[PDB]
A = this chain, B = another copy of it.
């Protein structure tokens, strides 16, 4: 026995707040959390306690510390079959990462609709409010490798596998409502442009390099999703606090055969929230696993990620009623024109057991639809349908990837396909072809119908010649970027200007910067001028005279495009740092922890060393991390309770911790003699909105802090932060 006698090696199998217990595989942390898919994986879960160590052939091993050798200082012998199996398996551990979205984090959960949608769709998972569909969801960045950092500036993926009773449906979306390009033929060009450059394989996780901006300057259709990327949408706080979108128009098909166009939305019930760029960039260094960690720890705490599925629905007869093409995936459908109808709720409530087996090997593909859905001719969706099956057979080693446990349907699947590498299913059917008489033609085709029917495509009319040509209706590139720009708050605009300015400053060939600023002048002259000033570029008179693009169907703005213009804050699952001293005022700590607990906000107790400190009343406080070990970047607000403030008053790291949190617009709360830290961040005696201060930490102090936290950041401080050296 190498475990400690006290049992402290094993985390409690109950919900616990971040940092309170070591994290664990999902089935051991939350063994009572079940759904049909989770249960179905029991055939392949493998335990360990009380079992002997063996080879993969079942032979017990006596000595797992040594190779077999001729004498104990002799050569290793070829007959050591136990060493060679162990080292061969290790030698073959890695598989290819995904070509894009290689970096991602996943969890299990469940979905149910609010009401039956049978009037618009015959899909079975949308038919009954009390029929629950398991899901597995992977969130991702796009450009970086599987070992890249989480809080980069990038688009994020949001892929949901729904294990329905009529097949797997994969809704493979991103966190912005449009993509960069119009036709899948260009996907390798765009991805190669954004990815590390091919001579030296730099930069990882960043679009701030010449080839990406070269492509953008030469392909104005990219500008819309570039605007989203350069805004704070490119730097979410958490995968719990971003939107999701399917991007393409799809179809819903009901039992009477009617097609309705649909775009898919996920609304985060925790609200929309993003980092600021200096925080995000520094956090890729202090904790490159911040989003993976925060997601796993939110589910271990019971702060399950919840999202509302929503549909924008457009009747068939209204296909051409907008000033943009519904099938153009560089155009969004403004919610002021077509509202999102609430459809159902998805809750992620258990982490996987083994990241490689369940997350790395999962395969999501947007051609996996079910009866009641269909595609459209969007030319980027069309080409996606070829790529996901093709790449998943390369990455997962052959055509039986649907038999890898995470990807298996929970509903029946039977057909005449056979063989392939690592075939697990042993078919007993005498026939491997149809039509057959020798098995009375089973398994059999099923006619389409209202429920449980075979799939039939909606009989869309196709009229045209065989052409490689872009629809002229797709040839407008600046109106949607402008609508997005005008819908942002002033601080969000400033952050967009700063994102383009920072990125193009890293473009070494100056003419590319100039060409991008010329594109920006076709969107908005105020944006283009503000970027140009930061680049040392002066717009020409012709640039100053470019006519702005038209409004989008009369809209001058749509506030649903902003992260912050409409309040939607939720503090449950956020975290505060509490900076301890060696004689903390216990009464402050009581009041602080009670008010945080009432709102579901977690706390991390920090100090200048690890171990414990004792409060004024004898209470022994364990320290979660040092001020340098868990920087302000990792929390949403900072509280300094009273005590022996002289202990930490001259500590550089405690002072910096407040300066960094202040620069990054976080609420700060100072009780009693902790108000002496007002001098590090230059707060006048009268106080400042976003700094909470009082003689002690009481009801009123904590309510004011929590109100600031519900607004996420203190935007009004922005003019005060350029002078702080942090």
Copies in the complex: 4
User: Are A442 and B385 in touch, CB under 8 angstroms?
Assistant: no
User: What are some 8 contacts across the A-B interface (CB < 8 A)?
Assistant: A64-B185, A65-B470, A66-B183, A68-B468, A92-B398, A97-B97, A214-B437, A282-B286
Which residues from B are CB-within-8-Å of A684?
Answer: none
Interface size on A, residues (CB 8 A): 236
**Which one, A189-197, A484-492, A668-676, is touching chain B?**
A189-197
User: Are B188 and A351 in touch, CB under 8 angstroms?
Assistant: no
User: Are A9 and B438 in touch, CB under 8 angstroms?
Assistant: yes
User: Are A285 and B289 in touch, CB under 8 angstroms?
Assistant: no
Kindly supply a per-residue 1/0 record for chain A positions 156-179, scoring 1 wherever the CB is within 8 Å of any chain B CB and 0 otherwise.
000000001011100000000000
User: Are B285 and A430 in touch, CB under 8 angstroms?
Assistant: no
Which residues from B are CB-within-8-Å of A394?
Answer: 91-92, 393, 398
Kindly supply a per-residue 1/0 record for chain A positions 73-99, scoring 1 wherever the CB is within 8 Å of any chain B CB and 0 otherwise.
111111111111111111111111111
Kindly supply a per-residue 1/0 record for chain A positions 102-127, scoring 1 wherever the CB is within 8 Å of any chain B CB and 0 otherwise.
11000000000000000000000000
Which residues from B are CB-within-8-Å of A204?
Answer: 147, 149, 288-289
Which residues from B are CB-within-8-Å of A61?
Answer: 415, 445-446, 454-455
Which residues from B are CB-within-8-Å of A411?
Answer: 58
Q: Does A60 contact B (CB under 8 A)?
A: yes
User: Are A77 and B79 in touch, CB under 8 angstroms?
Assistant: no
Contact of A421 among B95, B416, B471 (CB under 8 A): B95
Q: List the 5 shortest-distance A-B pairs measured between CB atoms, nearest first.
A: A71-B464, A145-B147, A285-B285, A62-B454, A58-B409
Q: Is the interface of A mostly helix, strand, loop or mixed?
A: loop
Kindly supply a per-residue 1/0 record for chain A positions 419-449, scoring 1 wherever the CB is within 8 Å of any chain B CB and 0 otherwise.
1111111111111111111111111111110
User: Are A433 and B192 in touch, CB under 8 angstroms?
Assistant: yes
User: Are A214 and B438 in touch, CB under 8 angstroms?
Assistant: yes
Kindly supply a per-residue 1/0 record for chain A positions 377-393, scoring 1 wherever the CB is within 8 Å of any chain B CB and 0 otherwise.
10100110111011101
Which residues from B are CB-within-8-Å of A511?
Answer: 4, 6, 8-9, 437
A378 vs chain B, min Cβ distance (A): 9
A361 vs chain B, min Cβ distance (A): 7
Q: Please report which residues of chain A, range 285-303, place their CB below 8 angstroms from some CB of chain B when the two chains form the complex.
A: 285-286, 288-289, 292-293, 296
User: Are A59 and B455 in touch, CB under 8 angstroms?
Assistant: yes
Which residues from B are CB-within-8-Å of A214?
Answer: 431, 436-438
Q: Chain B: which residue is nearest A456 at the CB level?
A: B62
User: Are A414 and B52 in touch, CB under 8 angstroms?
Assistant: yes
Contact of A215 among B52, B435, B462 (CB under 8 A): B435
Q: Does A560 contact B (CB under 8 A)?
A: no
Q: Does A598 contact B (CB under 8 A)?
A: no
Query: Given A48-B428, A92-B421, A189-B416, A58 and B437 touching (CB < 8 A)?
Result: no
User: Are B87 and A386 in touch, CB under 8 angstroms?
Assistant: yes
